[PDB]
Design a protein around this ligand. Structure first.
Ligand SMILES: CCn1c(=O)c(-c2cc(C(=O)NC3CC3)ccc2C)cc2nnc(-c3c(F)cccc3Cl)n21
Length: 349
């Protein structure tokens, strides 16, 4: 059963959407496409509709279209962005060229709310609790976000939060260059490619966000990769012998050994006037050795979140089958898989 579609010129392309979506209004740019706010008459929600630009122009584009759709289809959690709807105006695979993704529309990102509001300890508690609640779900699906930062955290007027942009990564070298927020939240082991990284990369990012919400200052605003590393090692100390042998890169080790050794600073002296429970948790997130960082599940049970923590209401996901990532296919083959995923989608209740 196919819905009725209507056409409309938005930005500089013709959007063709089911009738249920009304009053479409451009709200900027999303991951690989333009986004319109809309009113979903069927659910009563203000939604975000993303039209993918050129979804199948190359192999890399065709696979990432498939990748984003698979990712969104998998996530069913309050604190994680998920798929309300997905559609194409096409009546067959032969004419199938456009993909539209529909998600919840949270009013703004974390950057926006910090701009307009001065947040209390309770706001911080609630915001970080939701990030960790969502992250536990994401990690339980064996997915690494790897780009957690304020611009990827969608927040509404009620202080409710959803995580965006998980599992895509690959911000270009130039986008990560210099005095840029794109790199400030990144774990040092990923930033300088020290090793095969794990999901505690995201915990480092949470630590950087939490510190910023408490202090009102970027934690590690490096002017480049090396300046940032120096800022990081000043706070958390230089690597010890144990971590050094975990760094698989021989040049990276050689560089680390050249650095003057520094102890970890006293976090209570850095974050003066902060809840001692917040400082304790921050100490456990911002650990240089990624193996020794607190997990999202462990963090949820920390005393800092006592007023929010409910072990019966912190769900996990099914495993996410990522086998397609090692698969090499033609454009038409990625396109066919994407089509199947579009037509097989069953809406949430
Ligand atoms: C326009 C920015 N924005 C979005 O791009 C999305 C969105 C995000 C994703 C997404 O995270 N995809 C990756 C696979 C995880 C997919 C589709 C959409 C429509 C949700 C979303 N919710 N709120 C916003 C939003 C907004 F609408 C205005 C200002 C700031 C923000 Cl964060 N967005």
């Amino acid at each position: 059963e196919r819905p009725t579609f209507y056409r409309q010129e938005l930005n500089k392309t013709i959007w063709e959407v089911p009738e249920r979506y009304q009053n479409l209004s451009p709200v900027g740019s999303g991951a690989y496409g333009s986004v319109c706010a809309a009113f979903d008459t069927k659910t009563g929600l203000r939604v975000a509709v993303k039209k993918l630009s050129r979804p199948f122009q190359s192999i890399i584009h065709a696979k990432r279209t498939y990748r984003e759709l698979r990712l969104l289809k998998h996530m069913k959690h309050e604190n994680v962005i998920g798929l309300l709807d997905v559609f194409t105006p096409a009546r067959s695979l032969e004419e199938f060229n456009d993909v539209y993704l529909v998600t919840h529309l949270m009013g703004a990102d974390l950057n926006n709310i910090v701009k307009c509001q001065k947040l209390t300890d309770d706001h911080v508690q609630f915001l970080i609790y939701q990030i960790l609640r969502g992250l536990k779900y994401i990690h339980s699906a064996d997915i690494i976000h790897r780009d957690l930062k304020p611009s990827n955290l969608a927040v509404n007027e009620d202080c409710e939060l959803k995580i965006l942009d998980f599992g895509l990564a690959r911000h270009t070298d130039d986008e990560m260059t210099g005095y840029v927020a794109t790199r400030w939240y990144r774990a040092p082991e990923i930033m300088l490619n020290w090793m095969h990284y794990n999901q505690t990369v995201d915990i480092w990012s949470v630590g950087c966000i939490m510190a910023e919400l408490l202090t009102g200052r970027t934690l590690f605003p490096g002017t480049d990769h090396i300046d940032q590393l120096k800022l990081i090692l000043r706070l958390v100390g230089t690597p010890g012998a144990e971590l050094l042998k975990k760094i698989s890169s021989e040049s990276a080790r050689n560089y680390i050994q050249s650095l003057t050794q520094m102890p970890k600073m006293n976090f209570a002296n850095v974050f003066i006037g902060a809840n001692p429970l917040a400082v304790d948790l921050l100490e456990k997130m911002l650990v240089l050795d990624s193996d020794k960082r607190i997990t999202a599940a462990q963090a949820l049970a920390h005393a800092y979140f006592a007023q929010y923590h409910d072990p019966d209401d912190e769900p996990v996901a099914d495993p996410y089958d990522q086998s397609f990532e090692s698969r090499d296919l033609l454009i038409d083959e990625w396109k066919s898989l994407t089509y199947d995923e579009v037509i097989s989608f069953v809406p949430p209740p």
